[PDB]
């Protein structure tokens, strides 16, 4: 039932002084200081968390290999994939409507 | 098992602020906490977020409306006038 | 506690095959209302 103390000079509970209790091979109760929890990146359009990418603090992403930071397809990051399919369909149909609109206007109205 | 005769939703105010003043607030609280059917997706899930913002919980659309109601009588009357005026004059 | 006990029993009966879904769903809403006092009262009602 031994009580514990901090190990640094900051005595205040200020969302950056985070501790957890561990038991040591010497049979004592100490305090171990830990960092914050990373947040998962979100999608560009819908805003949901992308699957297959870990959640870390912004500095740790510089030490990890490329294949662990992306997904092998067009717009691998920042887009969920459901939104990617919508882009493909929407882009194709819009251009098709442009072809018929220009032929109709150029032919049926400039025949004179 | 009705728990109230006439006070209704404004029973959290107890015996304060006078009987008449409680009636006016009840008129306005009832209509802002209710749910309305979405005009785009059709589901019955539209609720107020801010003083003049209403958003659907299913299709995520966001629309600007009245303070305590999705639409106001003055604004509704103007759309019909504008629609009728536009289409006869230019077509 | 009582709600968890009654709901757990109903899942066991449906999977084994003692009752079908139409009777299961009706009993579920009867249990949500204060109908069955304890486990013994519910199984007795099922037999009848």
């Amino acid at each position: 039932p031994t009580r514990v103390t901090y190990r640094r000079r900051n005595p205040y509970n200020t969302t950056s002084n985070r501790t957890r209790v561990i038991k040591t091979p010497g049979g004592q109760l100490r305090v171990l200081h830990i960092k914050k929890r990373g947040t998962a990146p979100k999608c560009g359009d819908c805003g949901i968390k992308l699957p297959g990418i870990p959640a870390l603090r912004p500095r740790e992403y510089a030490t990890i290999s490329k294949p662990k930071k992306t997904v092998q397809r067009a717009y691998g990051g920042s887009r969920c994939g459901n939104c990617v399919r919508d882009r493909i369909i929407r882009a194709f149909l819009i251009e098709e409507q442009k072809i018929v609109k220009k032929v109709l206007k150029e032919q049926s109205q400039a025949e004179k | 098992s009705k728990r109230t005769k006439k006070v209704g939703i404004s029973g959290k105010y107890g015996t304060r602020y006078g009987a008449s003043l409680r009636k006016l607030v009840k008129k306005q609280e009832v209509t802002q906490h209710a749910r309305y059917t979405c005009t785009f997706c059709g589901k019955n899930s539209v609720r107020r977020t801010a003083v003049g913002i209403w958003s659907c919980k299913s299709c995520k659309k966001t629309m600007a409306g009245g303070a305590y109601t999705v639409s106001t009588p003055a604004a509704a009357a103007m759309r019909s006038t504008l629609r009728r005026l536009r289409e006869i004059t230019e077509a | 506690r009582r709600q968890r006990v009654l709901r757990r029993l109903l899942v066991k009966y449906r999977a084994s095959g003692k009752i079908d879904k139409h009777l299961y769903h009706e009993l579920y809403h009867l249990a949500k209302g204060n109908t069955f006092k304890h486990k013994r009262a519910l199984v007795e009602h099922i037999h009848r």
Partner: protein, 252 residues
């Protein structure tokens, strides 16, 4: 005596405006060639609420006619616009709710909002929740348009001013009572330091012109002349009449 309360507000030390949580002001786009001769369109990204104000704001994204980038703007949102809507601005824009087109290309009887006093100042008139202005008539020669303001006054503005069709959202905000002292405090705590407020009759003669006495009373006429020295204007200033408004108001 000392300096009275309403003289101190001009020094701007404690009675300033709280502005940490406000992101940007609400204005139109600058007048450019594209909007003077044709039209352009933009997407509505978000409908947001900013503190200290009703009339929720809207964020609109336009392109750039000369450079490879896009510019975001901030308008005041009319009732009925929704996220993803296409809105158009220019001289030849269609006449629907949310569009922005010059006040000349508008038939009489329509309601608009955020009208420019002069072409290019990006919105001055009618920009409060549930308010609008009405066009009355045109003068095709020496182009000038008659409008009616929310207060009832009439004005003449140049024919090139701009306006956005419809009614400012926010509806009837001021109907339900505040009903609680705390609710009034929260409303003003994000605007200015003006709550609470002390009656001048309860002060001492050194503090306010209404001063002290053995009974709480003013002691002299409460109507103050138009041209009086600062520190004297405490009451009804330049009042034309007084008392309960029974009949109709001749002024229009």
């Amino acid at each position: 005596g000392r300096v009275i309360r309403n003289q101190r507000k001009g020094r701007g030390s404690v009675f300033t405006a709280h502005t940490r949580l406000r992101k940007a002001p609400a204005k139109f786009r600058p007048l450019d060639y594209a909007e003077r001769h044709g039209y352009i369109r933009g997407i509505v990204k978000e409908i947001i609420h900013d503190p200290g104000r009703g009339a929720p704001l809207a964020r609109v994204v336009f392109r750039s006619p000369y450079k490879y980038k896009q510019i975001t703007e901030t308008f005041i949102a009319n009732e009925g616009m929704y996220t993803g809507q296409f809105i158009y601005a220019g001289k030849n824009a269609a006449l629907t709710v949310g569009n922005i087109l010059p006040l000349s290309s508008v038939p009489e009887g329509t309601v608009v909002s955020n009208v420019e006093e002069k072409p290019g100042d990006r919105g001055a008139l009618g920009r409060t929740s549930g308010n609008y202005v009405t066009v009355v008539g045109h003068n095709p020669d020496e182009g000038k348009t008659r409008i009616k303001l929310p207060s009832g006054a009439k004005k003449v503005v140049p024919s090139s001013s701009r306006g956005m069709i419809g009614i400012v959202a926010g509806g009837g905000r001021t109907d339900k009572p505040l009903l609680k002292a705390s609710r009034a405090k929260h409303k003003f705590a994000v605007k200015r330091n003006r709550w609470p407020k002390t009656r001048g009759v309860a002060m001492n003669p050194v503090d306010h012109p209404h001063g002290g006495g053995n009974h709480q009373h003013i002691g002299k006429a409460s109507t103050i002349s138009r041209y009086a020295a600062q520190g004297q204007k405490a009451g009804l200033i330049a009042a034309r009449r007084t008392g309960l408004l029974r009949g109709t108001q001749k002024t229009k």
